[PDB]
Design a protein around this ligand. Structure first.
Ligand SMILES: O[C@H]1CC[C@@](O)(CNc2ncnc3[nH]ccc23)CC1
Ligand SMILES: [Cl-]
Length: 167
């Protein structure tokens, strides 16, 4: 039993809700919140910009030190950093950005990072400003993640389409 509330159950391990991931994280304080990161951990917009804003830019400050030490992530890769005031940890995961021409096949690799954590609050990877089809992202999530994932979908119209089209 966990404290996630109001989710629709899609499969044994995948759950979905129309919610602002920032507000969900503040309420639940999950062990892991997933960020829709880029390889430079520049949290300018989308989910990343919103999460970082909610940390009063502390996420960005920590991220800049991480990059200065380690260099950029790989597309499809991840790193674990602090969750600041939102969660114990933030798993920064880089899905492919279609608006940069990146290979959508890397979306499966990106979701594999979730399997290193027993329970996560997450957005749909490569959705929104990353330009992928969110219906496809949900399919890859369900077919790749085996740990317990609670998906927050900001857009109510999109949430309803994801549910009604889910096979
Ligand atoms: O087009 C849709 C695709 C999924 C998404 O859910 C991605 N972006 C977010 N997902 C959850 N919480 C959030 N807060 C700010 C941004 C944000 C919405 C756009
Ligand atoms: Cl977005």
């Amino acid at each position: 039993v966990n404290s996630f509330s109001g989710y629709l159950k899609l499969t044994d391990n995948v759950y979905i809700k129309n919610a602002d991931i920032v507000e969900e994280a503040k309420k639940v304080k999950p062990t892991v919140v997933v960020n829709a990161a880029n390889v430079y951990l520049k949290h300018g917009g989308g989910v990343a910009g919103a999460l970082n804003k909610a940390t009063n830019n502390a996420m960005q400050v920590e991220s800049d030190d991480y990059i200065a030490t380690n260099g950029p992530l790989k597309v499809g890769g991840s790193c674990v950093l602090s969750g600041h005031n939102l969660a114990k940890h933030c798993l920064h995961v880089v899905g492919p950005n279609v608006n940069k021409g990146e290979d959508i096949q890397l979306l499966k690799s990106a979701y594999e990072n979730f399997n290193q954590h027993e329970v996560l609050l997450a957005p749909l990877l490569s959705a929104g400003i990353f330009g992928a089809d969110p219906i496809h992202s949900l399919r890859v999530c369900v077919d790749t993640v085996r740990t317990n994932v609670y998906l927050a979908v900001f857009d109510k119209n999109l949430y309803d389409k994801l549910v009604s089209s889910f096979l």
